[PDB]
Design an enzyme around this catalytic site. Structure first.
Site, mmCIF file in Angstrom:
data_model
loop_
_atom_site.group_PDB
_atom_site.id
_atom_site.type_symbol
_atom_site.label_atom_id
_atom_site.label_comp_id
_atom_site.label_asym_id
_atom_site.label_seq_id
_atom_site.Cartn_x
_atom_site.Cartn_y
_atom_site.Cartn_z
ATOM 1 N N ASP A 34 0.797 -1.216 0.000
ATOM 2 C CA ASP A 34 0.000 0.000 0.000
ATOM 3 C C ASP A 34 0.831 1.269 0.000
ATOM 4 O OD1 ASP A 34 -2.787 -1.148 2.096
ATOM 5 O OD2 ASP A 34 -2.169 -1.669 0.060
ATOM 6 N N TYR A 35 1.921 1.293 0.760
ATOM 7 C CA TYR A 35 2.730 2.502 0.832
ATOM 8 C C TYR A 35 3.283 2.923 -0.527
ATOM 9 C CZ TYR A 35 7.361 0.557 0.083
ATOM 10 O OH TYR A 35 8.456 0.005 -0.538
ATOM 11 N N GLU A 113 -23.992 -19.485 -11.619
ATOM 12 C CA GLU A 113 -23.389 -18.364 -10.920
ATOM 13 C C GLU A 113 -24.115 -18.097 -9.611
ATOM 14 O OE1 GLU A 113 -23.140 -16.442 -15.389
ATOM 15 O OE2 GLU A 113 -23.598 -15.132 -13.687
ATOM 16 N N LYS A 115 -26.067 -15.952 -6.893
ATOM 17 C CA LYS A 115 -26.988 -14.829 -6.992
ATOM 18 C C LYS A 115 -26.636 -13.814 -5.909
ATOM 19 C CE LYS A 115 -31.983 -13.964 -7.594
ATOM 20 N NZ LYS A 115 -32.060 -12.772 -6.695
ATOM 21 N N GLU A 170 -24.198 -6.861 -10.868
ATOM 22 C CA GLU A 170 -24.682 -6.468 -9.551
ATOM 23 C C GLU A 170 -23.742 -5.539 -8.788
ATOM 24 O OE1 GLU A 170 -28.557 -7.633 -8.110
ATOM 25 O OE2 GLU A 170 -27.348 -8.087 -9.877
ATOM 26 N N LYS A 286 -27.944 -20.519 -15.992
ATOM 27 C CA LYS A 286 -28.108 -19.982 -17.334
ATOM 28 C C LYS A 286 -27.718 -20.947 -18.445
ATOM 29 C CE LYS A 286 -26.754 -15.564 -15.260
ATOM 30 N NZ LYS A 286 -25.833 -14.395 -15.323
#
Ligand SMILES: CC(C)(C)c1nc(NCCc2c[nH]cn2)c2cc(C(N)=O)c(N)nc2n1
Ligand SMILES: NC(=O)c1ccc[n+]([C@@H]2O[C@H](COP(=O)(O)O)[C@@H](O)[C@H]2O)c1
EC number: 6.5.1.2
Length: 312
Positions: A34-35, A113, A115, A170, A286
């Site tokens: 992060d630094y 997948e 939900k 989503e 699906k």
């Protein structure tokens, strides 16, 4: 630092910082500490502070928001955002498969997948640039929440490839963020959100983008409004391609060749449920082949080529 030097350097920083952001927010796998990001981020802020004309829409400093709207403009979906048909038992699921086989005339593979419990959104890109963010609304008209979505860290402001496409998926609030937010509201005498779905929906309804930027919303994209620009021919391929172009996709998907494998998937994640950092209210099944999805078509309410198994 001259304006000429800052102009060039700013693009270098945006490019480098956005790549780190992609790894950290979209891949959930940072490469640098992060630094390293913070120091480069600070360098860019200094440049933008000195020459505000160098600030751009894809600059990572814009994630904190700033605009305050008076309301949301209507956002039409010329290509409708249908809803999903529901299934509630192993019976309903096998019945769905039987109907699909009856219509297609052969066994069919299914892309399964999770939900995600949240809000459905639509993201439009023109030449790789984020130009419109919208809620599903009633399916044909939603709200234009472009400014709010600019603060959602996993939403790319500029795709690597200058493609024009509209993807959908989503937007949700991870469990930890939901918990922290409610504590914050309790501390400030506010009403808590009953669940992550409501927290996400309520957050995207806020007119002050600076507040939204702090809500820690995230995304999982799973479809395209118009597959014209893209090459995918199956849903499984579409998920991989969405990832390829820069969007965050859910890693728990699975291509199942039989309805039995589909049911095994449902059971698998029904037990793994509590362990995910986000809430799910079911599984979406699906028909994998787009050619078969086309053949099945849509009822007035939803596609005939998909069904959502809802957890009891
Ligand atoms: C594209 C279809 C119709 C098959 C669809 N609809 C969903 N919802 C209703 C609204 C909509 C229209 N266009 C985009 N969303 C889904 C929600 C999830 C989830 N909640 O994670 C999912 N994995 N897949 C989903 N697939
Ligand atoms: N290590 C990385 O690549 C990376 C990328 C983006 C944000 N972060 C961290 O996320 C936090 C929030 O920073 P941003 O609001 O600029 O996204 C900071 O603690 C920052 O260091 C780390």
């Amino acid at each position: 630092l001259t304006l000429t030097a800052a102009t060039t350097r700013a693009q270098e920083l945006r490019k480098q910082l956005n790549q780190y952001s992609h790894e950290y927010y979209v891949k959930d796998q940072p490469s640098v500490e992060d630094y390293v990001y913070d120091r480069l981020y600070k360098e860019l802020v200094d440049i933008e502070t000195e020459f505000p004309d160098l600030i751009t829409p894809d600059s990572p400093t814009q994630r904190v928001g700033g605009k305050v709207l008076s309301g949301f403009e209507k956002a039409p979906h010329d290509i409708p955002m249908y809803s999903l048909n529901d299934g509630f038992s192993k019976e309903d699921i096998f019945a769905f498969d039987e109907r699909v086989r009856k219509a297609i005339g052969k066994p069919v593979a299914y892309c399964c997948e999770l939900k995600i419990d949240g809000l459905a959104i639509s993201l439009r890109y023109e030449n790789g640039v984020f130009v419109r963010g919208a809620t599903r609304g009633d399916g044909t008209v939603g709200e234009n929440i472009t400014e709010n979505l600019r603060t959602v860290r996993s939403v790319p402001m500029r795709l690597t490839e200058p493609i024009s496409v509209e993807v959908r998926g989503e937007c949700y609030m991870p469990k930890q963020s939901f918990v922290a937010l409610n504590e914050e509201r309790e501390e400030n005498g506010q009403d808590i959100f009953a669940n992550p779905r409501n927290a996400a929906a309520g957050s995207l309804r806020q007119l002050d983008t600076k507040i939204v930027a702090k809500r820690n919303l995230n995304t999982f994209l799973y479809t395209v409004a118009d597959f014209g620009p893209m090459k995918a021919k199956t849903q499984f391929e579409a998920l991989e391609e969405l990832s390829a172009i820069g969007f965050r996709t859910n890693p728990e998907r699975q291509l199942c060749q039989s309805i039995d494998e589909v049911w095994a998937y449902i059971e698998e994640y029904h037990e793994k449920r509590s362990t995910l950092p986000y809430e799910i209210d079911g599984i979406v099944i699906k028909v994998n082949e787009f050619a078969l999805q086309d053949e099945l078509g849509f009822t007035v309410k939803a596609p005939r080529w998909a069904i959502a198994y809802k957890f009891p």
